[PDB]
Structures are given as structure tokens and as C-alpha cells.
Amino acid sequence: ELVQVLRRGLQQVSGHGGLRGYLRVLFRANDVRVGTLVGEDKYGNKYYEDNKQFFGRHRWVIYTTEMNGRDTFWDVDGSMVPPEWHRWLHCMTDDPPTTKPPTARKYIWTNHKFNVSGTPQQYVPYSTTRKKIQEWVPPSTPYK
Amino acid sequence: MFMINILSLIIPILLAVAFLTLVERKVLGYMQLRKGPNVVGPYGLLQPIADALKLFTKEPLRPATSSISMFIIAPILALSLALTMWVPLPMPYPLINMNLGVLFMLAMSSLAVYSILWSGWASNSKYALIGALRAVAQTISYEVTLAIILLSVLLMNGSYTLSTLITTQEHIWMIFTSWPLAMMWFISTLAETNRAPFDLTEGVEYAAGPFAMFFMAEYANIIMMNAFTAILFLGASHDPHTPELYTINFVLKTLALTITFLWIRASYPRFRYDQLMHLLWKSFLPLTLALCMWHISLPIMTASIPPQS
Amino acid sequence: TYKFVNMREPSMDMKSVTDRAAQTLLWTELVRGLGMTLSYLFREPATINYPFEKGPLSPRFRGEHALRRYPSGEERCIACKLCEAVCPAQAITIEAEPRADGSRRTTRYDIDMTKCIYCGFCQEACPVDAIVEGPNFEFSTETHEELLYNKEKLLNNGDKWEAEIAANIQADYLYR
Amino acid sequence: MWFEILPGIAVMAACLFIPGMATAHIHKFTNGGKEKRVAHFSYQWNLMERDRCISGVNRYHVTKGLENID
Amino acid sequence: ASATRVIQLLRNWASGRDLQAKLQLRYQEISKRTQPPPKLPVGPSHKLSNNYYCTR
Amino acid sequence: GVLRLVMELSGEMVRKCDPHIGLLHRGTEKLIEYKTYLQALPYFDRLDYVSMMCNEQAYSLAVEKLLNIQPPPRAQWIRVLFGEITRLLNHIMAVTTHALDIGAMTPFFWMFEEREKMFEFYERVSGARMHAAYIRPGGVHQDLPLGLLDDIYEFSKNFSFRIDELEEMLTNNRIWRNRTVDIGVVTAEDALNYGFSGVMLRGSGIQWDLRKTQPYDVYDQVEFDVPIGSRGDCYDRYLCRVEEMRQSLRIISQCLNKMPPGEIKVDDAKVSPPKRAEMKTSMESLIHHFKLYTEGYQVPPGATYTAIEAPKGEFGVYLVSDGSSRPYRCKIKAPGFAHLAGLDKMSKGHMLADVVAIIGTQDIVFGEVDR
Amino acid sequence: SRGEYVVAKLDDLVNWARRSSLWPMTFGLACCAVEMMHMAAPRYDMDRFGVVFRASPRQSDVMIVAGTLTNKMAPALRKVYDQMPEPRYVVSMGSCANGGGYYHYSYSVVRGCDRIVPVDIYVPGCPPTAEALLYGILQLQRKIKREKRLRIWYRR
Ligand SMILES: CCCCCCCCCCCCCCCCCC(=O)OC[C@H](COP(=O)([O-])OCC[N+](C)(C)C)OC(=O)CCCCCCCCCCCCCCCCC
Ligand SMILES: CCCCCCCCCCCCCCCCCC(=O)OC[C@H](COP(=O)([O-])OCC[N+](C)(C)C)OC(=O)CCCCCCCCCCCCCCCCC
Ligand SMILES: CCCCCCCCCCCCCCCCCC(=O)OC[C@H](COP(=O)([O-])OCC[N+](C)(C)C)OC(=O)CCCCCCCCCCCCCCCCC
Ligand SMILES: CCCCCCCCCCCCCCCCC[C@@H](O)O[C@H](CO[C@H](O)CCCCCCCCCCCCCCC)COP(=O)(O)OCC[N+](C)(C)C
Ligand SMILES: CCCCCCCCCCCCCCCCC[C@@H](O)O[C@H](CO[C@H](O)CCCCCCCCCCCCCCC)COP(=O)(O)OCC[N+](C)(C)C
Ligand SMILES: CCCCCCCC/C=C/CCCCCCCC(=O)OC[C@H](COP(=O)(O)OCCN)OC(=O)CCCCCCC/C=C/CCCCCCCC
Ligand SMILES: CCCCCCCC/C=C/CCCCCCCC(=O)OC[C@H](COP(=O)(O)OCCN)OC(=O)CCCCCCC/C=C/CCCCCCCC
Ligand SMILES: CC(C)NC(=N)NC(=N)Nc1ccc(Cl)cc1
Numbered sequence A: 001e002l003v004q005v006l007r008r009g010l011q012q013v014s015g016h017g018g019l020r021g022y023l024r025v026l027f028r029a030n031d032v033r034v035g036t037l038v039g040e041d042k043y044g045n046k047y048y049e050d051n052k053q054f055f056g057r058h059r060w061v062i063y064t065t066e067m068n069g070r071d072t073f074w075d076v077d078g079s080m081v082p083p084e085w086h087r088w089l090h091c092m093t094d095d096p097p098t099t100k101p102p103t104a105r106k107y108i109w110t111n112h113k114f115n116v117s118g119t120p121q122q123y124v125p126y127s128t129t130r131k132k133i134q135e136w137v138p139p140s141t142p143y144k
Numbered sequence B: 001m002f003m004i005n006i007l008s009l010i011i012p013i014l015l016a017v018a019f020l021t022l023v024e025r026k027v028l029g030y031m032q033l034r035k036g037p038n039v040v041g042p043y044g045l046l047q048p049i050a051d052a053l054k055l056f057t058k059e060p061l062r063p064a065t066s067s068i069s070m071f072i073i074a075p076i077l078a079l080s081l082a083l084t085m086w087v088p089l090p091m092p093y094p095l096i097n098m099n100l101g102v103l104f105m106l107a108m109s110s111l112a113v114y115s116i117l118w119s120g121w122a123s124n125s126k127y128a129l130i131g132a133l134r135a136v137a138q139t140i141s142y143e144v145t146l147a148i149i150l151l152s153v154l155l156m157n158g159s160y161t162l163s164t165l166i167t168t169q170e171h172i173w174m175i176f177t178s179w180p181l182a183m184m185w186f187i188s189t190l191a192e193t194n195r196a197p198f199d200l201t202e203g204v205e206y207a208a209g210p211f212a213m214f215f216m217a218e219y220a221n222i223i224m225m226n227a228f229t230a231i232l233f234l235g236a237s238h239d240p241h242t243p244e245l246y247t248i249n250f251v252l253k254t255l256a257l258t259i260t261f262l263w264i265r266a267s268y269p270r271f272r273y274d275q276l277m278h279l280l281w282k283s284f285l286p287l288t289l290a291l292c293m294w295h296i297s298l299p300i301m302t303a304s305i306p307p308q309s
Numbered sequence C: 001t002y003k004f005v006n007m008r009e010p011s012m013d014m015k016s017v018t019d020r021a022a023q024t025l026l027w028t029e030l031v032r033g034l035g036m037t038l039s040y041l042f043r044e045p046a047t048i049n050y051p052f053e054k055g056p057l058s059p060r061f062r063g064e065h066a067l068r069r070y071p072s073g074e075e076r077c078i079a080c081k082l083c084e085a086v087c088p089a090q091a092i093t094i095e096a097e098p099r100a101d102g103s104r105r106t107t108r109y110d111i112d113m114t115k116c117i118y119c120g121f122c123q124e125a126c127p128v129d130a131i132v133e134g135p136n137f138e139f140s141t142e143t144h145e146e147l148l149y150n151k152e153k154l155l156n157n158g159d160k161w162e163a164e165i166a167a168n169i170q171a172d173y174l175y176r
Numbered sequence D: 001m002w003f004e005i006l007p008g009i010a011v012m013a014a015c016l017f018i019p020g021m022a023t024a025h026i027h028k029f030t031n032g033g034k035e036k037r038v039a040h041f042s043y044q045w046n047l048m049e050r051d052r053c054i055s056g057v058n059r060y061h062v063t064k065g066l067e068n069i070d
Numbered sequence E: 001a002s003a004t005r006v007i008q009l010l011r012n013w014a015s016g017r018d019l020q021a022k023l024q025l026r027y028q029e030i031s032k033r034t035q036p037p038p039k040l041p042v043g044p045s046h047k048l049s050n051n052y053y054c055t056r
Numbered sequence F: 001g002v003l004r005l006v007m008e009l010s011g012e013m014v015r016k017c018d019p020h021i022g023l024l025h026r027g028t029e030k031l032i033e034y035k036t037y038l039q040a041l042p043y044f045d046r047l048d049y050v051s052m053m054c055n056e057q058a059y060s061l062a063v064e065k066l067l068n069i070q071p072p073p074r075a076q077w078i079r080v081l082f083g084e085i086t087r088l089l090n091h092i093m094a095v096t097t098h099a100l101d102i103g104a105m106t107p108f109f110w111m112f113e114e115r116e117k118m119f120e121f122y123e124r125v126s127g128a129r130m131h132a133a134y135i136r137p138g139g140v141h142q143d144l145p146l147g148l149l150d151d152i153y154e155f156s157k158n159f160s161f162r163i164d165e166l167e168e169m170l171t172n173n174r175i176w177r178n179r180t181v182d183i184g185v186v187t188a189e190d191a192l193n194y195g196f197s198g199v200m201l202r203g204s205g206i207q208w209d210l211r212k213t214q215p216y217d218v219y220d221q222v223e224f225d226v227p228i229g230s231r232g233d234c235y236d237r238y239l240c241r242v243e244e245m246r247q248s249l250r251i252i253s254q255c256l257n258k259m260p261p262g263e264i265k266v267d268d269a270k271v272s273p274p275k276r277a278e279m280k281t282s283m284e285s286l287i288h289h290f291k292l293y294t295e296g297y298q299v300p301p302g303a304t305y306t307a308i309e310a311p312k313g314e315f316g317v318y319l320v321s322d323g324s325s326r327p328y329r330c331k332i333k334a335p336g337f338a339h340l341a342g343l344d345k346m347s348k349g350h351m352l353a354d355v356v357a358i359i360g361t362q363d364i365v366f367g368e369v370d371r
Numbered sequence G: 001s002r003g004e005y006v007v008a009k010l011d012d013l014v015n016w017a018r019r020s021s022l023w024p025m026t027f028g029l030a031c032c033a034v035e036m037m038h039m040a041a042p043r044y045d046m047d048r049f050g051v052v053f054r055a056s057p058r059q060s061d062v063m064i065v066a067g068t069l070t071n072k073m074a075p076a077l078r079k080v081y082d083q084m085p086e087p088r089y090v091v092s093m094g095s096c097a098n099g100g101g102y103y104h105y106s107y108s109v110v111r112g113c114d115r116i117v118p119v120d121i122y123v124p125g126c127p128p129t130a131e132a133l134l135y136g137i138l139q140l141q142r143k144i145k146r147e148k149r150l151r152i153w154y155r156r
């Protein structure tokens, strides 16, 4: 009935923590659905799951308001997620990183970085090999 | 106070045009299983503003080989005639109460035909000129059919007054009375407004600001046509002491008719030019003439001639 | 076997003629199309809320390239140039020399991502599983140069995506 | 869902409400709380002119009656 | 899905067919994204004897 | 978007059509000559990019015929199943884009959601949503992941309703009938001789189909009907395409029921690469992997012409091998080339919209037209 | 400064409109065009971002070069780019548009559309995923957000 739908909408309003939270999730995420929290990474992203939605909308992420040195309250990217939560969100597996932590290595990055194109941290190519032919340096002593 | 009334008639029409663009996009998306604009604002209630700002702060491309006089006059004429056709419409009281309001609408539409021809001839391009000529032919043919239908309908009204139309439709609906005329009127309004399945012109030279003028004029014409159809065939009950009920009912009917316009555009394919031309002269015009004869004969043979006053 | 799709003469009896005439005068099929479109309008949209929601993928997905390391930290590539031999687009350039400790290791390893066709032949031909196609697909750049990866960029990609790449390889290494 | 189209339709309805309501309110305000007289014919115009003359305040809507004649 | 009963009746009547049976959206009827490890079979030439390549 | 058309009109009629093809020519044949046999597979993958796996299958059949080897039965069944899936994709694209050119767009969006689901199937089986490069000479690259057949079955269950919804909007629509009926009529003899194949022949009424006359893979072990037109116009061709979609659904059901077990590539390490575990534990396997991925297998000298019933008609490969590991010559016969050549014949006595409808019903891919 | 504040706010307002309302002209030349149709499909729905499905060259602000640009086709691309009214942006989608792709060494292929038109965004892939193209479009939007036309003009 319409009454049930209105009650569900009011519950969604109350589920986000009042009015300010509802408005925040409406304006910076364009969706006000509520789902069970699965976990949170070290950057502030919150990952939610709701299996009642159809496939492709049953898992989502609310991005943090500040990642690394960039203010990401409005400017949110798809590259801001760490690799393990990236795999979980893209549904290559059914196991969240909290349940199945990734294997730890001494060379794996501890801090994740998003796309740095258009920024001073952007990648610039260069040749990684040494010079091929060495020239002959003339003697420093005059002959006459 | 009359200038205040004029502004209250004008500005809400433009706002309704912008939000009609928004509503059309969202309705088409939901019919096509998409979502439509829901990102720019809350549920997408900033897309018309963003589009207007971009089109205003977009560079124009006025051709060097073009008549500047016509290039400026055509959008001005189109917008002025789009806004003018709202002053005789009663809702429930017209801004300008005219004894002959219907003929004013016909004359305004006939003059509004000139905008397409002038815009086509201003570009000094052969292909745009040919497209404009085809559009002019389609518009004038469906103008003939609209005029005959509107003459047929008003024979049960007694005059050319839309207030008298309301008084006539106080009891029952002209759509109940003359539904075949309603069908042909709706199709002819679609063809006149050049909406699908009759968008042959869009199926170009103007850009940026002047393009927005034509867009607003076309959408205002669409809204005006839907409002006129709602008044003519879906007459609401008018209470002199609480006029707001009639206004609410009329606005709801106009919105329903415009939504039906969008629905038809989403649903149907496009006619060919010769196919739609044969649609009128060989299918609509004979039936229109027959129904005109029938509606002339009906009041006489049933002793139900409407009062002149 | 075969069948006819448009060979069916309509009946000419008065009932059928009247039905067809009513269909012509009263737009029955057009009303049917309107009803179908209205039903689709009242159905639920199939749009995901990108970038907060992502489309499903598979462990076999091919995206940004990366170079892996051993658990000991030594890089897996042994400078064998099967990459360069098997690359259809010739997007891989490899130069090698003996390392300071005598190992067979690369000194130049460049992949032109604007020339690569993302076909996945390089990770099939690797005898040591060094070069892989990572799951990342959101590495768009604002300049042409940034898409000319080198050994440092590929090693950084491998270190950055090592966990997810290792998980995908573990999940899909029995089919290879 | 499909109810997300309502806010745009609501704004359109609010915009289209303004013309008729404003016209009715202005007509009632400029005529002493009564509907504007419809002078479609010369007889009606003569009636309006006579009403204005008998009112004498140069307003046709100021109506006078039995208390005015006697 | 999650539509109201009146909406379901309206969409079924407008389309003319029962749309609840055939849904365009996938609701938990698809396979799990994580599957048990496989064990692929070997071909006919995985023989330790009488498998000379000159005969095949 | 890469078509240039020079049209001479008489008022409203079209008196001359001249297609100026060549805006998407890339020297694919010469590049294939410069590549090896394994490195030339993506070139066929990118020829007709709505029938990617069909082109892969045609090239694989040509190379296997030259090599005188035979794929395993499971590989053949997988190839047939994915060829039918690709046929569904191509027919959806053709019909929906034909409607999109002529007006209607809602069926385009619906059937493109269906195409998105089929692309999900493609990505699951190969890792690439469009250009799988999955069918290779000797079988297929990898075995099907567990649980893929169940999802294919679900998709096949929920597709006949989609076809019915598509037909509700176009089949009996009077506007669609006006736009497509008695336009682009071609007789059987003219169609043949101009060099027509597939849907054009079936619409004109010729009872010809490669899948039944010259079976390949395991197409002779399935039952399906071949639609036949009567008037040879756009409407008949559209009906034939819809019925072909239904028949491909039937074939997909049969393949799902009768998928066999076994290996997915020929057990010949001198042609098909050995498994990674064998390569990392066996010296012969390592040598064969090295040689196959560096030099490539040699093909005996000869010349072959192998044609398959791609969704757009007869797609053929004329492959000439000089005994090396790289093809000496590779001619690609695309069905759209002859159709676009015959466009001028079909456009006589019509208008611009009719020309658009004729192009749409010819279903031209300029990638395969130009190569 | 009040003038600095006003020009900054006006720049933010103008950039917001251009960022939110994008009307791209799709130059679909090859297989990369199919992924654009799938981005416009219901699942991703490029329309919901304010990116109109299609537009004419006169009313377009973004040109998406998606496909192999050949020598016989380059002049037409340059002509339509010239006909586009400023401000105009270019998104090169796919390997063929970015560099040469599979056809880099061909005699009849332009090795990168950046040899013909100035490209603003490069999207890598063959073909790029619909999500990849959507990410490229959003990156273009965020790049527009950093434009400072009025700030530069006021400091001239
Ligand atoms: C670009 C083409 C332009 C073409 C036109 C150029 C010249 C314009 C000349 C304007 C003449 C105005 C005539 C009316 C003057 C007042 C008379 C009066 O009070 O009439 C009462 C009548 C009352 O209507 P009635 O018929 O009900 O009257 C009977 C009822 N009583 C007696 C009680 C009043 O008003 C009308 O008839 C209204 C219709 C007027 C039609 C003429 C003006 C048309 C304007 C639109 C066309 C031009 C648009 C240009 C746009 C810009 C282009 C760049
Ligand atoms: C996109 C899908 C569209 C589906 C169809 C939507 C319209 C449904 C009508 C049938 C199809 C269209 C036929 C042509 C138009 C018919 C017009 C018609 O009959 O309209 C019926 C009613 C008005 O008719 P009515 O019954 O109110 O008027 C009575 C008239 N007399 C007194 C003379 C008998 O209008 C509507 O239903 C409006 C529909 C469009 C607007 C949708 C959003 C608003 C939803 C309802 C809000 C209700 C509260 C509003 C505020 C109230 C404050 C007190
Ligand atoms: C119903 C409403 C209809 C109208 C709606 C639209 C109008 C309302 C919104 C307008 C927003 C502003 C848009 C302006 C255009 C910006 C983009 C543009 O074109 O940039 C190109 C140029 C950039 O200049 P440029 O010279 O650097 O250009 C670069 C060089 N070329 C030309 C080669 C590209 O913009 C301008 O030149 C605009 C400058 C004037 C506008 C005002 C800026 C200053 C405002 C503050 C002044 C001081 C205030 C304090 C003191 C007051 C004292 C009285
Ligand atoms: C009748 C016509 C009405 C038209 C409008 C009807 C619908 C109106 C809906 C408006 C809902 C509110 C929108 C608010 C959007 C977000 C506002 C904010 O995010 O933007 C600010 C700037 O935006 C503007 O200031 C807000 C404008 C809101 C809309 C104003 C009314 C719309 C204009 C109406 C024009 C009508 C004429 C045009 C017709 C075509 C920047 O703030 P920020 O930098 O992040 O600060 C940090 C964020 N913190 C504080 C949470 C930490
Ligand atoms: C017919 C002509 C119409 C004229 C209308 C004139 C009126 C001005 C128009 C005002 C429209 C509303 C203001 C703009 C709405 C901002 C909405 C807000 O939410 O945008 C924020 C952007 O804020 C930016 O900081 C710019 C703020 C917008 C500009 C506000 C300027 C201040 C108000 C206008 C002042 C005008 C100058 C006054 C000088 C005295 C964040 O959104 P976004 O960027 O998408 O990032 C989120 C991306 N998601 C959705 C995917 C998560
Ligand atoms: C498939 C259909 C396409 C064929 C038909 C399309 C016709 C388009 C013809 C292209 C020729 C270009 C000229 C025609 C449009 C003129 C637009 C114009 O005048 O723009 C002026 C404006 C000038 O700058 P401003 O904005 O005023 O100042 C700020 C500077 N940043 O914009 C410009 O920058 C354009 C200036 C150079 C463009 C003109 C150079 C080419 C002229 C050669 C003559 C060609 C004429 C075409 C003849 C057509 C019949 C054969
Ligand atoms: C306002 C309420 C809205 C409710 C309806 C929702 C919207 C419905 C709109 C859907 C329509 C879709 C757009 C239609 C565009 C095309 C219309 C069309 O094709 O009609 C043409 C149609 C057929 O054309 P063809 O078949 O192509 O020509 C071949 C001839 N053998 O011709 C017509 O004129 C249609 C008929 C209209 C008039 C119908 C009159 C029926 C007969 C009236 C008999 C009663 C006489 C009164 C005397 C009574 C005596 C007691
Ligand atoms: C048919 C397509 C090109 N149109 C649109 N999606 N929106 C549109 N032309 N833009 C717009 C919005 C508001 C106003 Cl007042 C004037 C123009």
C-alpha cells in the first residue's frame, strides 16, 4: 500500500541518522537506500550490502570526505577504493576483505593512491637504460 | 496591475517549459528502462538551469552569408507568438476576454508558420531551405485540417468564446460528444508541433542562444496546444466563488495531455514525408469534411442549436 | 527444415473484414504499443549508481598491466622476451643485461598502452607469471605520454594491485 | 523508481497554477471583490457606463440601490 | 521485485502478460561469484604407453 | 558513421546511389600477412564487431582445415553455443538499430540491456566483453567457469518475453509496416547473381542456409528451422531475423542440454599450447610452449576457402599458406560487401527514408566492408 | 578582495553549468562505438549525468573520437571539430584513437587522433569498458571544474 511505502521512506530518512545525514547522502551520493554495513577501510570508505536489490545494486560504497591530501567531499572517483574492497565491490568474489584478508607482503603498498593525472604527481615517462656509446674525452694537457 | 498579470502569465510559462524539458527527459528514460537526470540536482531539479546557463554562455556561429535581419527576427517572432497565444485562454478567467478568441488562435498559428520559412531562408543554405520548405508544406496542410476540425467543434458551442466553451462543457465532455474529432485534432496538433511521429525536420544552423529561443517557443506551443485541447474537449466544472478548483483541474488535464505527447513520442516510429502527407489529404480530410457536414446537420435535426449569447 | 514467416492470406469473411476495418479506424495496435510502453514505464529501471556501484566482473578480466614479484621480493621477470615475441601489436619493448649479482634481469621494459589491444597474450606466454593484466580499468589520463608505461610504472602497478591480482590468479589458475 | 518523476511534474503544476490564480485574484482585487464585467456587446457596455455614471466615483463596480434612490 | 500490488496489476494488464515470472533483473538466482576449485580432465593423448606421435 | 553516399535525386525519387566506402580501411590483410597465425586471430576478432566469435570461428575452421586437425567435441559444442549467442547479439543489434534509424528507441534500450547481459557472459568466459579472442585453431582457449551454464539457462528462460515485447512494438505496427513493406524488393535471381547470401536470400525466398547445407562443428546434431520470406522486402527480412533469434534460442537450449565433458583444445602440443602445470614440470611441454609462443606452428603449404553462416550472411576466409609459420595471403569475404554493392539496385524508385531503411535492412558493418 | 571573490564565484557558477550539461557528438567509426551504445544503455545511462545521448555538431560541446581514424576520414573529423563551437573538448576512446592500436603500422591509419585535433582526455582499452568511458567522462567533468577563465581574465 501507499502507507507502507511512505513508512519505508520515513524509515530511510531515520536510518541515515536524522535529516542532516539524509540530506548529505542524498546530495553527495544521489541515493538514499539503507543497507547493512560490511566494513570500513583505512581511508574512511564505508561498504554496504543489500541482497534484496537486483544484481549490480546489492553492494555499494560511500566514499570518505577526505582521502590523502585531496578534499573528496564532492569530487569522488572510482579509483579511491583499495584493491581488496575493489575486488569485493566489483563482485569477483563473495568474500569481503574482513572475512578473507589479503595476503600480506613486504612490498605491497600500505597507502593507496587514486588517479593522479593532471596533478604534479602524474607519471612522466623516461628511458631506463644507460647511454649506448661513450665518447672520447680529449686530453687536458696541451701538446705544444 | 495589468502588467503584473502579464508577467504572471509570461514567466511561469517559461519556467514550465524548462521543467517540461526535464520531465520529458525523465519520462523517456523511465519508459526506456533508464533513470533520467538525477545527478545535477535533487532528483535532477537543476538540469534545465544548467542547460540554460550553458546555452547562454556558449559561443554562437552566425554565418557570414546570412541575412541578419531575418536571422534575428525569426526567433523573436516565434517566441512572441508562442507567448501571445496564452492571453485568450480562460483558466477560468482569460487575461484578455475576446469575443472571437478562436480566430485569434488560428491567426497567431498561421503567422507562427512564418518563423520556419524565415529561419530556413536566413541560413542561405540550399539543404536547410529544402527542409524548411517541407516543414512549411506539412504545417500548412495540418493547419487546414485543424481549422476545419475547430470549425466543426464550435458548432455545438454557439460562438467563438472559450468562456462559452466552458459553459457548454459544464455538464458533459466534448470528447464524449465528438471523439473522432478529438482523435483527428490530437493527431493534427502532433503534426503541427512537429513532434514524433512527425519530427521530419529533426529526423541545425542555429546554435547556442538563438537555438534556445526556438526550443522554448516550440515547447510553449506544445503546452498551449495541450491546454487548448483540454479546454475544448475536456471541459471542467467552474464554480464562480472558488475559481481555484477549475484552475487545478485544467492544469492537471494539461499535464496529462503533455505527458501523453511524450508517451507517444517514446512509443512510436517516424512517418515518412509522403506517407504523412497522404495521411492527411486521403485519410483525415475526407473524414473531417464528413464530420463537419454531420455536425452542421445535427443541431438542426435535433433542435439543439446553441444560443448565440 | 524451414518455415514461412509472411505467407498467410487473411480471411475475407464479413466478420474479419469488420475487425480489420475497426483496427484501421480505431488504432488498436497503436493502443497496444502504448500499453506496452506504459508497462515498461511502471517497471523498475536497470541503472546502477556509478561510481558508488560497479558492474560485475570476473577474475579473467583484462585491464591495466602489471609486473609481479616473488614473495621474497625479487621480481619474477627473467628477461625472456616471449612478451615481445607474442605481442600482436608489438607494444612491448624489452632490453636486458646481466645484473650486478649476475642474474638475468631486464633493464628496459616498456608497454605502449596506446598501442596495446589488451588481448592477454603476454600473460599466457609468461613462464614465470611476471606480466599480468590487472583488474584496474579506470586509468584514464589527460595526456598521451602518461599512457607510455615503463618498468618503474609497471612495478608500481604490480605493488599497488598485488593483493587483488594474486587473489584473481589463485581463483583462476586451475583453468589455465 | 517511477515516482522520481513527480518532483518535476509538481514544479510544472506549480508554475501552471500561477497564471489562472493570479488572474482571478487580480480581477477580484481591481473590482471590489467581484468578477470582472464581461462587456461582449454594446448593451453590456452601456450598462457598465450607466453604472459608472450613477456611482459617480468613476468606478462601475461601486453598486448603488434602494438606499440610493430613497 | 519490490513493486506495490496495484502497480503489479497495472503493469500486467498494460503489457498483457504476467511480468512477475519473467523479470529483466536478476534477484539472487544467478550463480555465486565464488565457486569451488575445478578439476579439468585430460585429453585422449595423456597416455604413458602406445602414444607415439608418429601415429597421431 | 563512416559511410559517404553520393545520391542523384529527381525531385523526391532516388535515381542513383553511389556508396563511397573506404573510410574504415586499415590494411588488415597486409597486417595479417605480416603477423603469424596466432597473432592474426584478433584481426578477425575486429572485422565484424557484432559477430566477433563467429569471425573467430571462421578463421579457426580455416586454420584447422589447413592443419588437418580436429577440435574436441566439447570445444565444438562450446563454439556452437557461443556462435548462437553471438548470433542473438548481432540480430538484436541489427533490429534495434534499424528501429532507431526508423524512429523507435525503447526496443533499442531494452534489447541493449539484454546485450549487456550477454556481454557479461562474454566477459565471464573470456575476460573481454567484446573482443574475446576465445575461439582459436584447435578448440577454445579456456574451459567454461563453473556455474556459467546455469546463468546461460536463466538468460535463455528470460529472453522469449523480451522478443515478444520487441514484436509488440514493431511487428503489427502500421507505421512500421508502411516503412518496411514493399521497400528494397529484390528478386531471387538478381539477389543471387549480385552475390547475395543469408538473410537476403531467405527473404527473397531462396531455401539456402550454410548451417544445414554444409554443416560445420556440430551444427548437424541440432534441430532448427530456417525462416523463408515471400516478398523479399524489409518487412520479410525483419520477420526472418526475429524467427532466426527464436531458432537460435532453441539451438542454445539444445546445446545446454547436450554439452559433453572432456578437454577443450586438441591434445596436440605442437599446435595447441600445453597447460601451465605441464609447461612448468615437463621439458617437452616447456619447449613446445616456447616455440608456439615465439615462432608459431607451421601450416602445410596450400590454399583453402572456408565459409560459415555468420549472422550477416556467408563470411569466408581464403587463406594461402606457403609452409611457413605466417600466412602468405589472407582474403576476407564479408557478406556486407556484396550487399552494399547491390544497394544501388535495391534503391531504384525510392526516397531518402527508403534508402535509410534499405541500408538498415542490409545491416552493413563498415569494419567488415572495408577491412 | 571583493572583486576576486566575485570572479571566483562566477567562475564556479559557469564551470558548474558546463560540467553538469554535456552534449557530446559521438564520432563512432569502429568497434569502440558499440561500447558507447552500451554506456547509453539502461545499465549505465549516460543521460542521468547530464550527458545527452546524441547531438548535432553545432550544439555539441564534446567530441568522442571512438574508432580507427583513417587518412580518408581525417579531413572530415577536422572539419567537424572546426565546426564545433567553443568551448569544445575531445575524448579519444580506444587504442585506435589514442595511438595506432592494432593498426599502428598500417599505411592507411592516422597514428592517433591527436595528430589532427587537440585531445583533452585519453581512455585506454580495446574496447574500453562502458565503466571506463564513464570514468573518462567524469574525469573530463572534474577537469572542467578546475578551469579558471574568469580568474585568469581578472588578473590580466
Ligand atoms: C513579422 C510580421 C509582423 C506582422 C504584423 C506587423 C504589424 C503589426 C500591427 C499591429 C496592429 C495591432 C491591432 C490591434 C490594435 C488594438 C485594437 C483593439 O483594441 O482591438 C480589440 C480586439 C478585441 O477582440 P474581439 O474581436 O473579441 O472584439 C470584440 C469584443 N469587444 C468589442 C468587446 C472588444 O482585439 C483583438 O481583436 C485582438 C487581436 C489583434 C490582432 C492584430 C494584432 C496582431 C499582433 C500579432 C502579429 C504581429 C507579431 C509581431 C511580433 C514581432 C515580429 C518582429
Ligand atoms: C507517462 C504515463 C501516463 C499515463 C496516463 C496518465 C494520465 C491518465 C489519464 C488517462 C490517459 C491520458 C488521457 C488524456 C488526458 C486525460 C485527462 C484526464 O482525464 O485527467 C484525469 C485527471 C483530471 O480529471 P478529474 O477527474 O480530476 O476531473 C473531473 C472533471 N469533471 C468535473 C468535469 C468531471 O487528471 C489526472 O489524473 C492528471 C494526470 C497527469 C498528472 C500526473 C501527476 C499527478 C497525479 C495525481 C495527483 C492528484 C492530486 C493533485 C492535487 C489535488 C489538490 C486538491
Ligand atoms: C534570464 C537570465 C538570462 C541570462 C542568464 C545568463 C547570465 C547570468 C549568468 C552569467 C555568468 C557569467 C558568465 C560570463 C562568461 C564567463 C565565461 C567566458 O565567456 O569566459 C571568456 C572570457 C575570458 O576572458 P579572456 O580575455 O581571458 O579570454 C581568453 C582569451 N580568448 C578570448 C582567446 C579565449 O570571459 C570574459 O571576458 C568575461 C569577463 C567579464 C564578465 C564579468 C567578470 C567580472 C565580474 C566581477 C567584476 C567586479 C565586481 C566587483 C566590483 C563591482 C564594481 C561595480
Ligand atoms: C520556480 C523555479 C524553481 C527552480 C528551482 C526548483 C528546484 C530547486 C531545488 C534546489 C534544492 C537545493 C539544491 C542545493 C544543491 C547543493 C548546494 C551546495 O552544495 O552548493 C553550494 C553552492 O550552490 C548554491 O549556493 C546553492 C544553490 C541552490 C539552488 C538555488 C535555487 C535554484 C535557482 C533557481 C533559478 C530559477 C530560474 C532558472 C529557470 C530555468 C556549494 O556549497 P559547498 O562549497 O560545497 O560547501 C561545503 C559543503 N558543506 C557545507 C556541506 C560542507
Ligand atoms: C534562464 C536562465 C537561468 C538563469 C539562472 C540564474 C541563477 C543562477 C543559477 C543557480 C543554479 C544553482 C547553483 C548551482 C547548483 C550547485 C549544486 C551543487 O551541488 O554543486 C556542487 C558544486 O559546487 C561548486 O563548488 C560550485 C557551486 C555552484 C556555483 C555556486 C555559486 C554561488 C551562487 C551563485 C552566485 C552568482 C554570483 C553572485 C555574485 C554576487 C557539488 O556538486 P558536484 O560538482 O556536481 O559534485 C558532486 C558529484 N556527484 C553528484 C556525482 C557526487
Ligand atoms: C555536411 C554539411 C556541412 C557543410 C555546410 C556547413 C557550412 C559551414 C562552412 C564552413 C566555413 C566557415 C565559415 C562559415 C561559418 C562562419 C562562422 C563565423 O563567422 O564565426 C566567426 C567567429 C570569429 O571569431 P569571434 O568569435 O567573432 O571572436 C573571438 C575569436 N576567438 O568564429 C571563428 O573563429 C571563425 C573564424 C574563421 C572561420 C572562417 C574560416 C573559413 C572561411 C573560408 C570560406 C568558407 C565559406 C564556406 C562557403 C560555403 C559554401 C561553399
Ligand atoms: C485525449 C485522450 C487520449 C487517450 C488516447 C491515448 C493516446 C492514443 C493515441 C495513439 C495514436 C498513435 C498516433 C497515431 C498516428 C497515426 C494515426 C493513423 O494512422 O490513422 C490513420 C487512419 C488509417 O490510415 P491508414 O490505414 O494508414 O490508410 C490506409 C487506408 N486503407 O485513418 C484515420 O483517419 C483514422 C480514423 C480517425 C477517425 C475515426 C472515426 C471512426 C468512424 C466514426 C463513425 C461514427 C460517425 C458518427 C455518426 C454516428 C451516427 C449514429
Ligand atoms: C531535444 C534535446 C536537444 N534537448 C534537451 N535535452 N534540453 C534543452 N534543449 N536545453 C534547454 C533547457 C532549458 C531552456 Cl529555458 C532552454 C534549453
Ligand SMILES: CC(C)NC(=N)NC(=N)Nc1ccc(Cl)cc1
Residues within 6 Å of the ligand: F001, F049, F050, F093, F097, F098, F100, F101, F364, F365, F366, F367, G028, G033, G037, G054
Ligand atoms: C557497424 C554496426 C555494428 N554499428 C551501428 N552503428 N549500427 C547503427 N545504425 N547504430 C546507431 C546507433 C545510434 C544512432 Cl543515433 C544511430 C545508429
Ligand code: SF4
Residues within 6 Å of the ligand: C086, C087, C088, C089, C090, C091, C092, C111, C115, C116, C117, C118, C119, C120, C121, C122, C123
Ligand atoms: S594484451 Fe596483447 S596487445 Fe597488449 S601487451 Fe599483452 S600481448 Fe601485447
Ligand code: SF4
Residues within 6 Å of the ligand: C076, C077, C078, C079, C080, C081, C082, C083, C084, C094, C122, C125, C126, C127, C128, C129, C130, C131
Ligand atoms: S614472458 Fe614473463 S619472463 Fe618473459 S619477458 Fe614477459 S614478463 Fe618477462
Ligand code: SF4
Residues within 6 Å of the ligand: C117, F046, G030, G031, G032, G066, G067, G068, G093, G094, G095, G096, G097, G101, G102, G125, G126, G127, G128
Ligand atoms: S581500439 Fe579496439 S575496439 Fe576500439 S576501434 Fe580499435 S580495434 Fe576496435
